[PDB]
Amino acid sequence: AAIPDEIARQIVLPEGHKDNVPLFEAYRWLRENQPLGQARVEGYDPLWLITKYADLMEVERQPQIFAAGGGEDKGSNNPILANQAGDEFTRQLLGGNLRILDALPYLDQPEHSVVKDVAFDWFRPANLKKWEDRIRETARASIDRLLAGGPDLDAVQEFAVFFPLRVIMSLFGVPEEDEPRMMALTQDFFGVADPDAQRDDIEALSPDAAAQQWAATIADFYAYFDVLVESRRAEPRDDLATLIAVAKDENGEYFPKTFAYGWFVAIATAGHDTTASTLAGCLQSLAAHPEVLDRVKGDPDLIPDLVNESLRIVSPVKHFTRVALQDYEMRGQKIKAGDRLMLLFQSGNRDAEVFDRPDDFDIDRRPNKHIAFGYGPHMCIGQHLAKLELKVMLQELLPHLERVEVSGEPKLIQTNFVGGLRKLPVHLTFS
């Protein structure tokens, strides 16, 4: 049978993610009682909810069966779950399809492989070492401002958001004075269904509001990135903007500008927001588990383990969708050609078949098998930059912290997509 309606709504509807406790209890109910069922929520297409770690890997390693963008019918699947009214808005705007960005999540092989190869080498761990000193100087400047501002703050809006934004805009080539604009458009982009992040220029209460906000935000990013692409093509620099802006295909022709736009939107949004969420979630966990803060100050070589367990627990990228290109049997269920799937990375990260005491914050999981970056050819391109920035910041910050106390009510972004904390009121004790 269909998944029970209140479990299905908890995961599908963005409002279901406002509070992590009922959300994670819904993922757990499925993993334990209905690990592969179809959610049939009013206003949404039917979705197979992929809740089990093994099933996330099985789907993601088979892109010839489970497409992101619809395969040869390009744009026939939206990889980022919108409601039906929203997908209808987008088909009206684009003319029949949902490919509103040329960014990697919307692409299938072989197009996906050709475009990803433009930046694959730049993002490898050996090619990121040249940025470590600049990252460390940025972390140290951010920590100097934290110490100067005193012990009482919102660890998100008054600390964690700034470091990853400055890192990516510096590597990317965007000037420091444009950081506030990029931060505002990132809030619009990941806040399409959050009541406190509504744009002024869209009908907030329309059935397709989130889709209108998504489209409006992308148009603003395009306007900004068109100037940057033309600038770097005219005058190349040694920055990531140039690598993407000047990229040419196998025939020597630039990729269409929208392909650069797509990289730039992904880097300008996911490139800082997920890292900020993970850092704030790490601070929240160190408040709950002060013995962990003591241990990592005692042995700074535990910092990568702390980053891996923060990634597993926070898991800020909650899903992407796939479509079945053929019928496929999994876990005793018959997925039919055309059926959509929702990949629940946060649920995979709590799967008791893989993780002992999966809700416990345990930095001693070695290896830490988390799937917070996903899997398969679409696996996070930024993962190594994220792990480096979080390592460098924790190496510089934790010596300066004796204790983190949460002094006020935490707030999460209301989204089923790219979430995590927007507010974490703390009282810090500095060393």
| Residue 375 touches ligand HEM, criterion: CB under 6 A | yes
Q: How far apart are CA 138 and CA 395, in angstroms?
A: 13
- In degrees rounded to 5, what are phi and psi of residue 278? -70, -40
Cite the annotated binding site by residue number: 112, 322, 375, 378, 380
Contact (Cβ atoms closer than 8 angstroms) between residue 30 and residue 2: no
| Residue 190 touches ligand HEM, criterion: CB under 6 A | no
65, 185, 260, 385: which one binds ligand HEM (CB under 6 A): 385
| CA proximity to 103, closest of 189, 200, 204 | 189
- Judged by beta carbon, residue 260 or residue 267, the one nearer ligand HEM is 267
Contact (Cβ atoms closer than 8 angstroms) between residue 259 and residue 225: no
Q: Taking the complex as a whole, how short is the minimal distance between the CB of residue 353 and ligand HEM, in angstroms?
A: 19
Q: Taking the complex as a whole, how short is the minimal distance between the CB of residue 79 and ligand HEM, in angstroms?
A: 8
- Judged by beta carbon, residue 5 or residue 249, the one nearer ligand HEM is 249
Q: Taking the complex as a whole, how short is the minimal distance between the CB of residue 20 and ligand HEM, in angstroms?
A: 16
| Residue 267 touches ligand HEM, criterion: CB under 6 A | yes
3, 39, 265, 372: which one binds ligand HEM (CB under 6 A): 372
7, 98, 317, 325: which one binds ligand HEM (CB under 6 A): 317
Strand partners, 425: 154
Contact (Cβ atoms closer than 8 angstroms) between residue 413 and residue 419: yes
Sequence-ordered list of residues with C-beta below 8 angstroms from that of 133, at least 6 positions apart, any chain? none
| CA proximity to 85, closest of 47, 44, 46 | 44
Q: Taking the complex as a whole, how short is the minimal distance between the CB of residue 73 and ligand HEM, in angstroms?
A: 18
Q: How far apart are CA 364 and CA 343, in angstroms?
A: 27
| Residue 320 touches ligand HEM, criterion: CB under 6 A | yes
- In terms of phi and psi (left: phi > 0; alpha: psi -120 to 50; beta: otherwise), the region of 338 is left
Angle at 262 between CA 376 and CA 341, to 5 degrees: 40
- Judged by beta carbon, residue 57 or residue 153, the one nearer ligand HEM is 57
| CA proximity to 397, closest of 134, 136, 130, 152 | 136
Sequence-ordered list of residues with C-beta below 8 angstroms from that of 329, at least 6 positions apart, any chain? 335
Give exposure, 96-120, as e/b (b: 16+ Cβ within 10 Å). ebbbbbbbbbbbbeeebeebbebbe
274, 284, 346, 347: which one binds ligand HEM (CB under 6 A): 274
Q: Taking the complex as a whole, how short is the minimal distance between the CB of residue 7 and ligand HEM, in angstroms?
A: 22
| Residue 71 touches ligand HEM, criterion: CB under 6 A | no
Site for ligand HEM in 410-429 (CB under 6 A): none
How many residues in the shown chain lie near ligand HEM by CB under 6 A?
29
- Judged by beta carbon, residue 86 or residue 271, the one nearer ligand HEM is 271
- Residue 119: both structure tokens together: 């930046």
| Residue 268 touches ligand HEM, criterion: CB under 6 A | no
Cite the annotated binding site for heme b by residue number: 112, 322, 375, 378, 380
| CA proximity to 368, closest of 303, 416, 320, 316 | 303
Q: How far apart are CA 6 and CA 338, in angstroms?
A: 25
83, 186, 213, 275: which one binds ligand HEM (CB under 6 A): 275
User: Quick one: angle between helices 209-234 and 257-288, nearest 10?
Assistant: 120
278, 321, 346, 415: which one binds ligand HEM (CB under 6 A): 278
Q: Taking the complex as a whole, how short is the minimal distance between the CB of residue 170 and ligand HEM, in angstroms?
A: 12
Stretch that binds ligand HEM, among 90-98, 209-217, 282-290, 374-382 (CB under 6 A): 374-382
| Residue 262 touches ligand HEM, criterion: CB under 6 A | no
Stretch that binds ligand HEM, among 1-9, 214-222, 313-321, 351-359 (CB under 6 A): 313-321
31, 378, 391, 422: which one binds ligand HEM (CB under 6 A): 378
| Residue 63 touches ligand HEM, criterion: CB under 6 A | no
Contact (Cβ atoms closer than 8 angstroms) between residue 287 and residue 426: yes
380, 403, 425, 427: which one binds ligand HEM (CB under 6 A): 380
Enumerate binding residues for ligand HEM (CB under 6 A): 60, 104-105, 116, 168, 266-267, 270-271, 274-275, 278, 311, 316-317, 320, 345, 372-376, 378-382, 385-386
